[PDB]
Amino acid sequence: TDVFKLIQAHEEKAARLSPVEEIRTVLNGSICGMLSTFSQKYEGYPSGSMVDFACDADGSPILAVSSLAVHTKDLLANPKCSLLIARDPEDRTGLRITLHGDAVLVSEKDQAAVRSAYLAKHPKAFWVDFGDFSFMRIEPKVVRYVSGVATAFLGSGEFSKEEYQAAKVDPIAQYAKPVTSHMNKDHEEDTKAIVHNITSIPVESALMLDLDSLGFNVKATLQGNTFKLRVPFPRRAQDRKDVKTLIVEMLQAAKS
Amino acid sequence: DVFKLIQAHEEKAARLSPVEEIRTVLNGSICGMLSTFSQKYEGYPSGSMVDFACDADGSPILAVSSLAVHTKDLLANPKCSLLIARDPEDRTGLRITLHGDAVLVSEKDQAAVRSAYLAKHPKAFWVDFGDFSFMRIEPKVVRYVSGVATAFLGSGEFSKEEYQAAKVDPIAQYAKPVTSHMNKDHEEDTKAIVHNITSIPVESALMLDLDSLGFNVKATLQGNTFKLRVPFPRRAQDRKDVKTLIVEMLQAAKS
Ligand code: HEM
Ligand code: HEM
C-alpha cells in the first residue's frame, strides 16, 4: 500500500551499474540459454533449443555445436539467430536478455582463445575436442532486455553492437556465487538488518541475489509481498576481500 | 558393468508410448520459451519466456499483452515454436518443441480457454485487463529430444493428428503431491523398491514424475547420477490406487 511507494523511491535512487554495463555483466556470467533459429526441417517456422555458451572477451556468445544436432543444421542454413538469457531462469520477474546476431564458425587462429573461454565456463566439457564438434560465435547485431515483468518496476531497452561491446564487465560480479551463498546460509540475519537500516523497511527475510562492485541485490518479503531491493555499498568495492570488509562496515553501521 | 545393467532394465520397463509421454508432459507444463520472427529486427528470430496452458486438444493457450514484444511479433507473423523442458534445469532431460501458428481465440471459446489457463495459473488476474488477449498455438508438428550427453538418446516427431489423438495420462496430474510426500518422508521406501526391481544398490532414489504405469527416479551409486524407470506391477486406476500399489511393491521388497 504505502510501502510499495517507499520501495519505488529507494529503487530510483540506489547506486547501480549503468544499463549497458549491467547487461554486459549478466551476459558474461551466464553459461546457458535458449537459442532461436529458423527451422531447416520445418520450413517457415522458427525453432528453439537449450544451449550452453560462454562469452568471449568481446561479449560474443561462443557455442560448441555437434554437427548431429538440429540447431546446428539450422545455423548452417541460416546464421541469423537469437539467444535468450534469464538471470534467474524461474524468476518470472527477473532480468531477461535477448541477443540477436549471426552465427559464424570460429577461425583456426581463434580456436585457442575460444576453447579456453568456453572451458572457463564449462570445465568438464571434454567433448569439445570430438571431431563432430565445432565452435561457433554469435556476432551481435542488437542486445535487448526486459526486466520486472508482472511488477510495478518494469525496465526495457536495447543496445547496438558498438554500445554492448564497448561496455566493461564489472570485475566484482565473478565473486557473486561464494559471497551470496555464505551470506544466505550463515548470516541471513545480518542481511535483513542491513536492508532494514538503509531502506527503513522492516523485512521478514532478505536473500542476496547477485553482487557487483557497487552493491548487491536482495529478494525481500513483507506480509504477503515479495520484492527486490538494491543495496548499494557506501563506496565501490575494489576486490573480493573488499566486498567482505564493506559488508562488515555496513553491518556495524546498522548497530547504531 | 552397471551402465549395461541399467540400460537392459530401461529397455524393458513398462512406460508410456512416446506420443502419450509427450502429450502428458506438455499438458503438465505451464511455462516455456517462445520463438517468433522478430518484427523489429527483420530476418532474425526472437525468444521470450511465456506462461501457457494446454487446452483439451493439447494446444498451448497464451495470455499475451498488446504491450509485449512477442505479441507484436505474433500479430505480424503467427508462426512460432514453444520449447518446454520437463525438468528445466536438467541438461539431459526431455525437451519438447511444438511448432505452430498462434491464433486469436474466438468469442465463443473465450470461457473454456480462460478456465483452462486459470486452472494452470490460478492467480493470473491480469488476463481480464483490456490489453491482454488469449491466443492458441495450433500445432503443426511436435518434436522431442531426450538424454543429451547420456547413453540414453531418444528423439522423434509427431504430426498434429498423432499428437491430438493421444490421451493425457490420467494419473500424471497427481505427480507433484505423491512425489513430494514420498521424497521427504519415505526416501528409504523408494530405495528398497528400486533395489528390489533393478538389483542396484542405490545410495539414494528420488522420485521425479509419475504416471499410470509407474514412476521415474534420479538414483545415485558411487559418483554417478542416472534415471531409472520403476513400473507398477499393473496400471494404476486413481490416486488411492497409486498409494495401494506402492505399499505392495515395498512389501515385496522386504523379501
Ligand atoms: C501489478 C502490476 C502489474 C502486473 C500484475 C503486470 C503483469 C504483466 C504480465 C503478466 C506481463 C506479461 C505479458 C506477456 O507475457 O505477454 C506484463 C508485461 C508487460 N508489462 Fe506489466 N504488469 C504490471 C505493471 C506494469 C506497469 C506499471 C507497466 C508500465 C508502467 C507495465 C508494462 C508492461 C510491459 C511493457 C510489458 C511487456 C514486456 C515485453 O515486451 O515482454 N506493467 N505485465
Ligand atoms: C551413440 C551415442 C550417441 C548418440 C546417438 C547421440 C546423439 C545425439 C544427438 C541426436 C544430438 C543432437 C541434439 C539435438 O538434436 O538438439 C546430440 C547432442 C549432444 N551430445 Fe550426444 N549422442 C551420443 C553420445 C553422447 C555422449 C556419450 C555424450 C557426452 C558424454 C554426448 C554429448 C552431447 C552433447 C553435449 C550434445 C549437445 C551438442 C549441441 O547442443 O550441439 N553425446 N547427441
From Swiss-Prot, chain A:
Q: Name one GO cellular component term.
A: chloroplast
Q: Which residues fall in a coiled-coil region?
A: none
On assembly, the entry states:
Homodimer. Binds to heme in the interdimer interface; the heme iron is coordinated by a fixed water molecule.
Q: Does the keyword Transit peptide apply?
A: yes
**Keyword entries, A-Z:** Chloroplast, Heme, Iron, Metal-binding, Oxidoreductase, Plastid, Transit peptide
What EC numbers are recorded for this enzyme?
Answer: 1.14.-.-
Per the record, the gene is: HOZ
- Which species is listed as the source? Arabidopsis thaliana
Query: What does the record give as the function of this protein?
Result: Dimeric beta-barrel protein binding to heme and catalyzing its degradation to produce biliverdin. May function in the tetrapyrrole biosynthetic pathway.
Q: Where is this region: Dimerization?
A: 32-52, 80-102, 141-144
Q: For this UniProt entry, what is the primary localization, expressed as one broad class?
A: plastid
Subcellular localization: Plastid, Chloroplast
Q: Which residues bind heme b?
A: S66, V70, H71
Site (Dimerization) residue list: E158
State the protein's name: Non-canonical heme oxygenase HOZ, chloroplastic
- Under the GO molecular function aspect, what terms does this record hold? heme binding; metal ion binding; oxidoreductase activity; protein homodimerization activity
Q: Which domain of life is it from?
A: Eukaryota
One GO biological process term is:
heme catabolic process
